[PDB]
Design a protein around this ligand. Structure first.
Ligand SMILES: Cc1cc(OCC(=O)O)cc(C)c1Cc1ccc(O)c(C(C)C)c1
Ligand SMILES: Cc1cc(OCC(=O)O)cc(C)c1Cc1ccc(O)c(C(C)C)c1
Lengths: 116, 115, 115, 116
């Protein structure tokens, strides 16, 4: 898969399990069209969101439901979600790993972009 | 002010200067209504976005134009911007500092919520 | 001062208060000589560690006692501390702010080097 | 292996390749004894540092040579290295992944600790 999401929990030092992830792609009319969705596994990973054929050039948004994650652990976090927005495939097809590191009042996100 | 934004540049080890920042409030129809904006100062700070009277409870989005910043420095960036979405809440402390740390392919953001 | 330390808590969304910080300078024999120390303020800041005269070029280590901080909050931490090791250099800007962002199993540190 | 190190470059959005890593363990006399060393692979990973038998309880230091990494890319970075110090195995054997994210003037580090 050309798009993978990996989420870690900085409080527990663990993968962030069962985190909902929604992906959108900006349409020609500038709206966000639903593209794919899933939830992270026991390893904090979400694979199989898309395919090489489908994942064309465009502006994509990956919205990670961090608030539901923290709420289920009894925590009222600051952010509603973590949303990473990016242009994909503009110099040709690439593989993207979107890595997120979560704390109740902070998150970081990083992209690892490789040429397949 | 109840809301301040502070932006640092992890490549240069400096405040991130002249970064455009837009603030939006979520409307009843779930659209984002522009609320305030500015550019960060020589110290990477943006003050005076709102007032205590105006900044009522709601869902807010702070959009930091990281892409234009990296473009101005001749460095290829990954993100279109960094968005920071949160519910502002009266019961808690209520001065918010949104701190962001920028790299071309990574950012972190943290909230410092006080008094 | 030429050196300031600012520490934030990513769990509480607050300055990290009363965190012990020790500064060391690398000696000629490669050992670390204690130089200065303090505890962060109510704003998570530690000022006045050194002076422009004293803070000559050399290799410095700032050790932030994160473990005692998490212990004080009843939260299990991973690291013994966060160390920040750098060469201080006259040609460049020379006011250093060491910013640290703390979580129980993660920390980040950044240098803001100005004027 | 109970200890793995993974290093990413936040400027290029890539693994950080050929980064030297030195591991030390605190001795009974409070000195740092050399424990293991290696360098990151093309995937930014360093495997095989130790074994279950060898990796007993103790205080360990993982020193990642970030300065040489940046210097080889023409950059004069702020830090001499990234050094992550931690007590290991104090509630029994665990697997540790030490993840580091590098920028010229900043780094973050995170531990993922799992029960084998
Ligand atoms: C929020 C903030 C306040 C501050 O006050 C000290 C000053 O203005 O001199 C000084 C600095 C440098 C920051 C920014 C900061 C301070 C600490 C920190 O962990 C982070 C994370 C985003 C990496 C950011
Ligand atoms: C992206 C990624 C890939 C990975 O490969 C799987 C494995 O080898 O276990 C293993 C891990 C732990 C990560 C996550 C990671 C790896 C490095 C890193 O600096 C960061 C920051 C976002 C904190 C995250």
């Amino acid at each position: 898969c050309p798009l993978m999401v990996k989420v870690l929990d900085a409080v527990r030092g663990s993968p962030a399990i069962n985190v909902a992830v929604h992906v959108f792609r900006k349409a020609a009319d500038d709206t966000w069209e639903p593209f794919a969705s899933g939830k992270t596994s026991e390893s904090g990973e979400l694979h199989g969101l898309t395919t090489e054929e489908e994942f064309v050039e465009g502006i994509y948004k990956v919205e990670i439901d961090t608030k539901s994650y923290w709420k289920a652990l009894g925590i009222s976090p600051f952010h509603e979600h973590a949303e990473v927005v990016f242009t994909a495939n503009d110099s040709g097809p690439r593989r993207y790993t979107i890595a997120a590191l979560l704390s109740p009042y902070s998150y970081s996100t990083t992209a690892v972009v490789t040429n397949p």
